């Protein structure tokens, strides 16, 4: 396995990341109390406790969002997937940044993602589970959205609306993309043979 393309053309990493992002997003929504705790049930993933919503439409929304993220991952068009927490005025208060690098060549010397996927991804999940300790209290009535930072260069004349797998997406406006000099809180970094991923939170200063 010399190359990224050897792992089913990026499909393996995309699938593993989408499975991971779904569980991480649910856990974020729980620990930050974006939704009432009563919709979340306790499950196990990566042999560690996780908290997953049983609300059908919220579930489907998260899945639909990640269904759009998957092809972007496969074509190596993702630098970040960000869970953005918005206050009641719709201003970012907090961002959970999953910064992803998929180099074209596998790093020979790093540990095998696929042999240790449980342990490696569990470590992120465990940091999310207890992150409420290190973050500020969010104001009441927060919502979330998901921002995808792509590898694509912006062109002068580009349509704001971009349809992906039949769902309309939009170029993110400065209200969401910009936080004024946020405080950066590191949670976890991993370098594996196939994937480099860093999780950190940006909080409003």
């Amino acid at each position: 396995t010399l190359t990224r393309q050897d792992l089913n053309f990026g499909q393996v990493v995309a699938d593993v990341l989408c499975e991971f992002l779904e569980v991480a997003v649910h856990l974020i929504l729980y620990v930050r109390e974006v939704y009432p705790v009563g919709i979340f049930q306790k499950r196990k993933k990566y042999n560690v406790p996780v908290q997953m919503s049983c609300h059908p439409e919220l579930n489907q929304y998260i899945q639909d969002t990640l269904h759009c993220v998957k092809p972007l991952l496969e074509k190596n068009d993702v630098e970040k997937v960000v869970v953005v927490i918005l206050d009641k005025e719709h201003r970012p208060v907090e961002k959970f940044v999953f910064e992803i690098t998929q180099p074209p060549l596998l790093s020979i010397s790093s540990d095998s993602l696929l042999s240790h996927v449980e342990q490696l991804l569990a470590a992120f999940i465990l940091k999310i589970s207890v992150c409420d300790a290190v973050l500020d209290h969010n104001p009441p009535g927060c919502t979330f959205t998901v921002l995808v930072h792509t590898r694509e260069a912006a062109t002068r004349n580009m349509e704001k609306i971009q349809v992906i797998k039949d769902f309309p997406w939009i170029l993110a406006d400065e209200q969401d993309v910009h936080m004024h000099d946020p405080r950066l809180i590191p949670l976890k970094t991993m370098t594996s043979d196939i994937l480099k991923m860093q999780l950190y939170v940006e909080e409003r200063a």
Binding site: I39, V84, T150, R151, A153, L171
Partner: peptide, 25 residues
């Protein structure tokens, strides 16, 4: 050079819609 950053046009279900579903059982 700036890259394309995108978000869904539609919001996730509101907290209140979920509260109502929960309270209904």
């Amino acid at each position: 050079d700036k890259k394309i950053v995108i978000m869904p046009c539609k919001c996730a279900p509101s907290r209140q819609l979920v509260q109502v579903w929960l309270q209904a059982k």
